[PDB]
Write a protein that binds this ligand. Structure first.
Ligand code: QN8
Ligand code: QN8
Ligand code: QN8
Ligand code: QN8
Ligand code: QNN
Ligand code: QNN
Ligand code: ZN
Ligand code: ZN
Lengths: 194, 194
DNA sequence: CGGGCATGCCC
DNA sequence: CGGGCATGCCC
């Protein structure tokens, strides 16, 4: 009955976890202490999928944004009117895109109105321990009429072809002009005032 | 042949001049030194019309915004996509509105695509030396996808019913959250660095 | 590139 | 209300 998707971590029977590459001026950088990705708008944000056990054929990987703060959780995260107007398969209203994938699907939920982007799950290549997806966030966190400075979480779910939830993980995202500066600022704030 | 309207002051045979009331946190304030109005979005910005001689019946008062800097003069000044979407008679794309007037006309030029807003000229009441029009600016100067931090001029023209230009005056506008702060900052910059 | 201005807003 | 943070950007 809820229109707010769960953000509860569920690593599940397949041992599903997210991973991030190690990285002022940088195009993205991930803070383990904050569980937070800092990245630039319309630029590659790699996310690694790690599993202990192999998902069944036909498993799908869904990404969805939700506002982090309780006061905004019920509002659908959308692209701002400016970036919606300056717009391949991604509807211009969608914040999150996937690049480099020929089987991407963009979904608008008939009941909750929430946007999500889905690609097939593929196991890592021989010798690799993870699968990397290239996400793109098409607005800054600050965009007026869109996220409007409100932090979001990205929720990544592993789902089988039948719709069973196999795993769920989430990370906070700040899309900003200066990821390196802002990560250092927030980590210092955590140490000094958190 | 030009699509850029003239901004040249032409006080003309009727002795046409603009006037402004004397005024942090203030909703508007005019700087004589800068010939610049500082005002808040969607709030009253009174402009006084002064003439030495009485215009003929059917005279009209037109207001139009142009970008002040040479690099942007040829671009039409428009409302940003966010404020256009969150919108009486004024088309949502128009930056400048007039409130309190039952004969307001909003014009989109067929050839130059520029927006303007027009009201009839009315002489001052007995004992008064000027006529006041209440303008509203529907975006901040900073609005992304609109003025985008670029200064504008407002051009006020007195035109007879036949289309003759009787007078022209202009003033710079900064639409901003804190007119009093920003006026003091710019006037200090003028004294120290201008 | 990094230093520092910008400017709506602080929940 | 004013002090000062915010955060894309400096032409
Ligand atoms: C955004 C990511 C990173 O974390 C670094 C810098 C750019 N990409 C790949 C490596
Ligand atoms: C998660 C794995 C690794 O450890 C490296 C970088 C990303 N994938 C493939 C090789
Ligand atoms: C915006 C104008 C002014 O200059 C002062 C303050 C509010 N209005 C009327 C007087
Ligand atoms: C321009 C005139 C004045 O001097 C005062 C204020 C505005 N109008 C009417 C009275
Ligand atoms: C973040 C900051 C930088 O380091 C360069 C890119 C964006 N911004 C301006 C220059
Ligand atoms: C300009 C500044 C003020 O003085 C109040 C109104 C807008 N802004 C925040 C509070
Ligand atoms: Zn945006
Ligand atoms: Zn606007």
């Amino acid at each position: 009955s809820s229109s707010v998707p769960s953000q509860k971590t569920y690593q599940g029977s397949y041992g599903f976890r997210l991973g991030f590459l190690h990285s002022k001026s940088v195009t993205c950088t991930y803070s383990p202490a904050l569980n937070k990705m800092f990245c630039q708008l319309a630029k590659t944000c790699p996310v690694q999928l790690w599993v202990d056990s192999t998902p069944p054929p036909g498993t799908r990987v869904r990404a969805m944004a939700i506002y982090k703060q309780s006061q905004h959780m019920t509002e659908v995260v959308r692209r701002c009117p400016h970036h919606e107007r300056c717009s391949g398969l991604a509807p211009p209203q969608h914040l999150i895109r996937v690049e480099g994938n020929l089987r991407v699907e963009y979904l608008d939920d008939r009941n909750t109105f929430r946007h999500s982007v889905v690609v097939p799950y593929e196991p890592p290549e021989v010798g690799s321990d993870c699968t990397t997806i290239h996400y793109n966030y098409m607005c800054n966190s600050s965009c007026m009429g869109g996220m409007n400075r409100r932090p979001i979480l990205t929720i990544i779910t592993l789902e089988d072809s039948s719709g069973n939830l196999l795993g769920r993980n989430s990370f906070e995202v700040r899309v900003c002009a200066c990821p390196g500066r802002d990560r250092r600022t927030e980590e210092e704030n955590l140490r000094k005032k958190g």
